[PDB]
Amino acid sequence: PLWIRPDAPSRCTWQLGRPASESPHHHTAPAKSPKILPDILKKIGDTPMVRINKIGKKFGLKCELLAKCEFFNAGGSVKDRISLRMIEDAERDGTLKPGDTIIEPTSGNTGIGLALAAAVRGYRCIIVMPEKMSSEKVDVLRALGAEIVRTPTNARFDSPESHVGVAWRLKNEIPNSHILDQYRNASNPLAHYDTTADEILQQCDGKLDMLVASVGTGGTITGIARKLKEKCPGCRIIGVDPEGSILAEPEELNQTEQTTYEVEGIGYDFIPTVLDRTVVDKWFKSNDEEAFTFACMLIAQEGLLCGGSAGSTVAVAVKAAQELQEGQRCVVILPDSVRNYMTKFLSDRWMLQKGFLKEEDLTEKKPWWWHLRVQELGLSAPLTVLPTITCGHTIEILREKGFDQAPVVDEAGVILGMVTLGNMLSSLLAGKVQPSDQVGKVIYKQFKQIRLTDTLGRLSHILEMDHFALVVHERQMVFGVVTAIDLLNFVAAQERDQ
Amino acid sequence: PLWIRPDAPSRCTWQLGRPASESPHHHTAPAKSPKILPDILKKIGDTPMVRINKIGKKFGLKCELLAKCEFFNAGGSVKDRISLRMIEDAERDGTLKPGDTIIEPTSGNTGIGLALAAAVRGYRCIIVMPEKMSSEKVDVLRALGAEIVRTPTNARFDSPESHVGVAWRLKNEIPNSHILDQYRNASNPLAHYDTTADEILQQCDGKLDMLVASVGTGGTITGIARKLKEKCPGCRIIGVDPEGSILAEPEELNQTEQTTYEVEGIGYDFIPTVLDRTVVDKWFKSNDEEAFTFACMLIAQEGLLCGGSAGSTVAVAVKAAQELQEGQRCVVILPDSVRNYMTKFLSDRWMLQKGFLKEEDLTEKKPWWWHLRVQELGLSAPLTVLPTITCGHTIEILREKGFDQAPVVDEAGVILGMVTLGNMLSSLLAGKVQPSDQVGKVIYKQFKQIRLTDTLGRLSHILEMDHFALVVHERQMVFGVVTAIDLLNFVAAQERDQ
Numbered sequence: 001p002l003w004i005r006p007d008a009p010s011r012c013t014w015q016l017g018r019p020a021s022e023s024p025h026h027h028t029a030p031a032k033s034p035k036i037l038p039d040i041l042k043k044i045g046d047t048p049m050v051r052i053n054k055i056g057k058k059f060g061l062k063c064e065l066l067a068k069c070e071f072f073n074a075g076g077s078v079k080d081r082i083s084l085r086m087i088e089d090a091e092r093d094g095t096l097k098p099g100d101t102i103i104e105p106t107s108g109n110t111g112i113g114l115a116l117a118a119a120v121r122g123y124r125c126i127i128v129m130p131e132k133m134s135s136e137k138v139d140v141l142r143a144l145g146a147e148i149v150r151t152p153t154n155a156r157f158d159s160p161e162s163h164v165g166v167a168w169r170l171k172n173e174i175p176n177s178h179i180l181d182q183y184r185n186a187s188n189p190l191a192h193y194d195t196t197a198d199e200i201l202q203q204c205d206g207k208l209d210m211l212v213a214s215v216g217t218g219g220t221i222t223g224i225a226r227k228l229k230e231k232c233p234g235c236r237i238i239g240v241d242p243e244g245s246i247l248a249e250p251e252e253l254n255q256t257e258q259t260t261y262e263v264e265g266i267g268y269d270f271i272p273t274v275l276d277r278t279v280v281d282k283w284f285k286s287n288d289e290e291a292f293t294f295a296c297m298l299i300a301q302e303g304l305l306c307g308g309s310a311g312s313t314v315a316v317a318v319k320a321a322q323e324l325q326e327g328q329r330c331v332v333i334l335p336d337s338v339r340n341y342m343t344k345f346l347s348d349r350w351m352l353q354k355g356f357l358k359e360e361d362l363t364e365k366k367p368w369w370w371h372l373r374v375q376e377l378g379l380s381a382p383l384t385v386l387p388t389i390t391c392g393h394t395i396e397i398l399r400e401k402g403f404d405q406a407p408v409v410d411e412a413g414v415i416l417g418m419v420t421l422g423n424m425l426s427s428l429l430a431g432k433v434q435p436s437d438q439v440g441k442v443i444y445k446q447f448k449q450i451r452l453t454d455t456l457g458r459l460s461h462i463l464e465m466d467h468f469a470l471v472v473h474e475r476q477m478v479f480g481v482v483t484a485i486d487l488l489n490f491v492a493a494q495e496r497d498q
Numbered sequence: 499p500l501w502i503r504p505d506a507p508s509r510c511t512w513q514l515g516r517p518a519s520e521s522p523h524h525h526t527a528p529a530k531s532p533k534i535l536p537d538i539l540k541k542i543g544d545t546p547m548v549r550i551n552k553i554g555k556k557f558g559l560k561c562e563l564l565a566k567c568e569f570f571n572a573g574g575s576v577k578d579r580i581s582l583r584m585i586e587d588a589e590r591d592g593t594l595k596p597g598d599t600i601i602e603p604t605s606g607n608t609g610i611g612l613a614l615a616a617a618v619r620g621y622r623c624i625i626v627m628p629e630k631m632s633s634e635k636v637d638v639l640r641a642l643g644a645e646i647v648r649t650p651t652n653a654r655f656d657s658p659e660s661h662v663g664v665a666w667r668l669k670n671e672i673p674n675s676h677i678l679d680q681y682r683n684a685s686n687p688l689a690h691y692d693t694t695a696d697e698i699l700q701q702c703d704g705k706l707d708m709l710v711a712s713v714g715t716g717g718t719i720t721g722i723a724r725k726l727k728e729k730c731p732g733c734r735i736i737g738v739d740p741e742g743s744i745l746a747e748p749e750e751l752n753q754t755e756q757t758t759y760e761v762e763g764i765g766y767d768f769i770p771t772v773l774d775r776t777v778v779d780k781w782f783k784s785n786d787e788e789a790f791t792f793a794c795m796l797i798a799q800e801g802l803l804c805g806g807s808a809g810s811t812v813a814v815a816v817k818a819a820q821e822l823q824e825g826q827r828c829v830v831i832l833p834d835s836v837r838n839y840m841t842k843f844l845s846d847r848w849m850l851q852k853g854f855l856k857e858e859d860l861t862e863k864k865p866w867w868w869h870l871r872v873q874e875l876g877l878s879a880p881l882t883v884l885p886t887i888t889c890g891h892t893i894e895i896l897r898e899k900g901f902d903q904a905p906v907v908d909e910a911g912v913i914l915g916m917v918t919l920g921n922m923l924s925s926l927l928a929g930k931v932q933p934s935d936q937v938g939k940v941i942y943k944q945f946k947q948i949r950l951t952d953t954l955g956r957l958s959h960i961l962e963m964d965h966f967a968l969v970v971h972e973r974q975m976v977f978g979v980v981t982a983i984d985l986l987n988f989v990a991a992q993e994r995d996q
C-alpha cells in the first residue's frame with residue numbers, strides 16, 4: 001500500500017520562542033549572485049518590493065501599502081522558488097539521481113517551476129493538474145517538454161482521481177520516479193522561511209506592521225509568518241482563502257453553497273500538512289468577482305501585470321488594513337503573472353460569460369457616442385473596381401474621380417479587399433509594381449463588415465483589431481468605408497459643436 | 499503640412515573617437531534603486547546576463563555564449579527601457595505636460611512599455627500597430643487602458659495607412675497630443691547607450707569579443723555598438739535582419755521574393771533615422787523557420803521563456819560565432835518574452851498551419867506507440883447507469899459487480915459523465931451527499947470521445963486536456979474508458995515484454 005495523506009497532522013516540533021539553532025532541517029542562507037548566472041535558475045528570488053500608490057488611497061487606506069511582486073521570477077510565479085529548493089534538497093539527500101523522473105500534483109505554477117528546472121537539469125517531468133486550470137499553463141509546460149495529465153476539478157482529494165491520487169498511482173507505475181509532494185515536503189515552507197522572509201525584512205529594514213498572503217499550500221504564509229514572529233513579532237499575519245475552501249478559521253467562515261471557484265492556485269478541500277494555521281492571526285474570505293475586479297484594477301492603475309490570486313490578496317488587504325494608520329505599512333504578496341490568464345479574466349467576453357461583468361456598469365463608463373448608430377457618421381458611397389484591373393488604370397480612375405480609395409469587388413459580388421492611391425503610388429514609385437501589374441500584390445486584404453444600424457462602440461472594437469470597416473447589407477453593394485480616423489473626426493467635430 | 503519622415507538621414511555629428519564630453523544630449527548615468535521602489539517603472543533595467551550551456555555546444559561553438567535576457571523588464575520587453583527614457587526626457591523638455599495624450603506607432607512591445615508608463619503617470623495613450631501583431635499584445639494593452647488602432651501589415655511606410663502615417667493624422671486631429679517617435683527620437687539609442695551598454699560591460703568586466711543583436715529600430719544595436727566601440731573597441735557588432743527587410747548591407751543580401759514574415763518587432767521597409775548602419779561590422783539574414791525553431795529550442799533546452807526575435811538572434815549567433823575560439827565570449831540580446839506569442843509559435847497547430855513544422859520530423863521524435871491503435875489496449879466494456887439513480891444504489895451496484903467506475907448514460911443515450919466509487923464514498927463519508935441524493939452533485943461531467951480506430955498519440959493529446967477518454971461509435975454505446983494510467987500501464991507492460 002503506498003499513498004501518503006497530504007492532510008496528515010504536522011509532526012514538526014517547532015514552537016515560537018525556540019532558538020533557531022535547534023532546527024534539524026538543513027538551512028541555506030541567501031547568497032549574492034555572480035555577475036554572470038550559469039543558468040536561468042539563479043534568477044529565482046530577489047523579487048522587487050513596490051509601493052501601491054493609487055489603489056491604497058482610493059479605498060481610504062492611510063498606511064503605506066507595499067507589494068512583493070513574485071511574478072518577476074524566471075517562471076513567473078512564487079512556486080519557482082520552492083521548485084528549486086525541493087529539487088536541491090532532494091539532490092543533497094541522494095533521493096533524486098540524474099535522469100530520474102519527477103512527478104507532481106500542482107495547480108500549474110509549481111508545475112511550471114519544476115518543468116523548468118527539469119529542462120535545465122535533465123530530469124523527466126510529468127505534471128498532474130486539474131482540468132480547471134488555464135490552457136496557457138499547458139502550452140508553456142508542453143513547450144518545456146513536460147508530459148501532462150489532468151484530473152477532474154470536482155474530484156475530492158481522497159478519491160483515486162484527485163490530482164494527488166493519480167500522481168501516486170503513476171509513481172507506483174513508473175520506475176525511478178519520485179514525488180516531491182509540495183504539500184508535505186518541508187522544503188516549501190523552508191524556502192519561504194529562509195529567503196522570502198529575509199528579503200521582506202531587509203527591504204522594509206525590519207519595520208513591518210501587517211502582512212497579507214493568500215494560502216494555497218500555506219508554505220508562503222507559514223514560512224513567512226514563522227520567521228516574522230521570530231524577528232518582527234508585532235507583525236499581524238492575514239490569510240486569504242477563496243469561498244469554497246475550508247482553510248479559514250473559525251469554521252463559520254467556511255459555511256457556503258458553491259463548491260467551485262474560478263481563481264486558480266489558492267484554496268483546497270483539505271489542510272496541507274505544511275500549513276500551520278496557528279500562526280495566522282486572522283482569516284478573510286474572498287470571491288472570484290473581488291479577485292478579478294482588483295486584478296484588472298491593479299493592472300490598469302499600478303501597471304502590475306499579475307494574476308487573479310494577487311487580486312484576491314489585495315482585495316482583502318484594502319479591508320484588513322483599514323485598522324492601520326499613517327506611518328505604518330502593510331505588505332501584500334503577489335504570487336503570479338498574467339501570462340497564465342491571458343484568455344480568462346483578461347478577456348472581457350469570458351468575464352461577461354462568467355457573470356463577473358454587468359453591461360450597465362460598462363455603459364456608465366462608456367463615452368456618449370458609444371451608444372450611437374454608424375449612420376450618424378453620414379459616410380459617402382465609395383467607388384468599386386474589378387480585380388482584373390491594372391495598377392495604372394486604378395491610379396487613373398481614382399485621381400480622375402477624386403477618391404483616395406476603392407473597395408475591390410467582383411462580378412460575382414465578392415468583396416476582395418481595398419486599394420489606396422497612396423499605397424499604389426508608393427509601390428509604383430518604389431518599383432515594387434508595374435502599371436500593367438494586377439492589383440492582386442497591392443490590395444489590402446483584411447477588413448470587417450458592418451451594418452448601417454450597428455453601434456459606434458462595435459466599430460471601436462473592430463478598429464482594435466482591423467483598420468477597415470465596410471458597411472454592407474445582407475445586395476453585397478458597399479454603402480461606406482470607415483477607419484479609426486473617420487470616427488475620431490466625427491467625435492472631434494461633435495466636441496466643437498457644443 | 500505635418501509629417502516627419504522616419505527614414506530621414508541622421509543629422510547626428512557623432513563620429514568614432516570624439517570625446518564623450520562634446521555630446522549636446524543630456525545623459526543620465528545608471529543609479530542604484532532604493533530598497534522600496536516608489537512605482538513599477540523603477541523595475542526597468544538591471545536585466546540578468548545568463549550563460550547558454552547546451553545550445554552553444556550543440557552547434558560546435560567553442561566560445562562562451564551569453565544572453566542578455568531583456569524579457570525580465572516590467573513590461574517584458576526591451577522597449578520598456580526606451581519608453582521610460584523617451585517620456586522622462588520629454589518631461590524635462592517641457593514638451594509633455596500632465597494629462598497630455600501620447601500617440602505611438604509600434605510593433606507592440608514599445609506600445610506596452612508606453613501604456614504602462616501612462617497608466618502609472620496618468621497620460622492618455624493611443625497605440626497604432628500593424629494588424630499582423632498578435633492579439634495577446636492587444637489584450638495586455640486594452641487591460642492597461644490604452645486605445646488601440648490598427649494598420650494594414652502590407653501598407654508601405656510612405657502611405658497614409660502605414661502605422662506612422664495614421665499616427666501623424668491622429669496627432670493632427672487630437673489636441674495637446676505628442677508623438678515621441680521612437681524612429682527619430684535620440685532618447686531611444688541614448689537609453690541603450692547610457693544603461694544597457696554599461697550593464698553589458700560591467701557584467702562582462704569589460705571583456706567582450708562579439709555582440710549579436712536583431713534590429714527593428716536599430717536603437718539597441720546603435721547605442722550599444724557606439725559605446726562598445728568607445729570602451730571595448732575590439733568587439734565585433736553583428737546585425738540580424740529578417741528576410742523581407744531592407745536594413746542589411748550589402749544590398750545583395752536583401753534580394754528576395756517574400757515581402758512579409760511572421761516574426762514580430764524586427765525588420766522594416768525603411769531605414770530609421772536612429773539606425774547608424776556604419777557601426778555594424780556585418781549583417782546576417784534570418785527567416786521565420788529559423789527563428790521559431792531556435793525559440794522553441796531555447797525554451798525547451800535553456801528554460802528562457804522568450805520571443806521569436808530572440809530565436810532569430812540566437813539562430814544567427816550560432817553561425818556568426820563559429821570563427822571564435824575557447825576563452826572568447828559572444829553576447830546575444832534577447833528582446834522579449836513568450837507572453838506576446840502564447841497562441842502563435844507556442845501552439846503546434848499554428849506552426850503546422852504556417853508550414854514551419856513537418857509531420858515526418860515529428861514522427862521521428864515520437865515514441866513507438868505514438869502510431870498505434872486504441873484497440874491495442876484490449877480495454878473492457880463498462881457498466882452504465884441512469885442519471886436518476888441514487889448515490890447509495892450506485893455504490894451498491896459498483897461493489898457488487900466489482901467496477902470502480904461507470905459512465906452515466908441516459909434512456910435517450912446521451913452520455914452525461916462519469917461516477918466513481920472512490921469519489922462517491924469520499925463524498926458520503928464526508929457528509930457532502932446522502933445515500934438518497936441524486937448522482938447529479940458527484941458526477942464528473944468532463945470527458946472526450948474516441949473511436950476504437952484512433953491513434954494513441956491522439957489519446958495522449960486528449961489526456962493533456964482531459965482525464966477521461968470514452969470509446970464510442972457514431973449506437974451511442976460505450977466500448978471503453980481510458981485514462982492516462984491505462985496508457986501508462988500498457989506502455990510499461992510492453993517495456994517488460996521485450
Ligand code: HEM
Pocket residue numbers: 009010011012013014015018019020021022023024025184185186187189190193222223226273274
Ligand atoms: C527550532 C525549529 C524547528 C525544529 C526543532 C523542528 C523540528 C522538526 C522535526 C523534529 C521534524 C520531524 C522530522 C521528520 O519527521 O521528518 C520536523 C518536520 C517538519 N518541519 Fe520542522 N522544525 C523547526 C522549524 C521548522 C520551520 C521553521 C518550518 C517551516 C517554516 C518547519 C516545517 C516542517 C515541516 C513541513 C516538517 C515535515 C512535517 C511532517 O513530516 O509531518 N519546521 N520539524
Ligand code: HEM
Pocket residue numbers: 507508509510511512513516517518519520521522523682683684685687688691720721724771772
Ligand atoms: C560626442 C558625441 C555626440 C555629439 C557631438 C552629437 C551631436 C549631435 C547633434 C549636434 C545633433 C543634432 C541635434 C538636433 O538636431 O536635434 C544630434 C542628434 C542626434 N544624435 Fe547625437 N551626438 C553625439 C552622440 C550621440 C550618440 C552616442 C547617440 C546614440 C547612441 C546619438 C544619437 C542622436 C540622434 C538619434 C539624433 C537625432 C537625429 C536627428 O534629429 O536627425 N548621438 N547629435
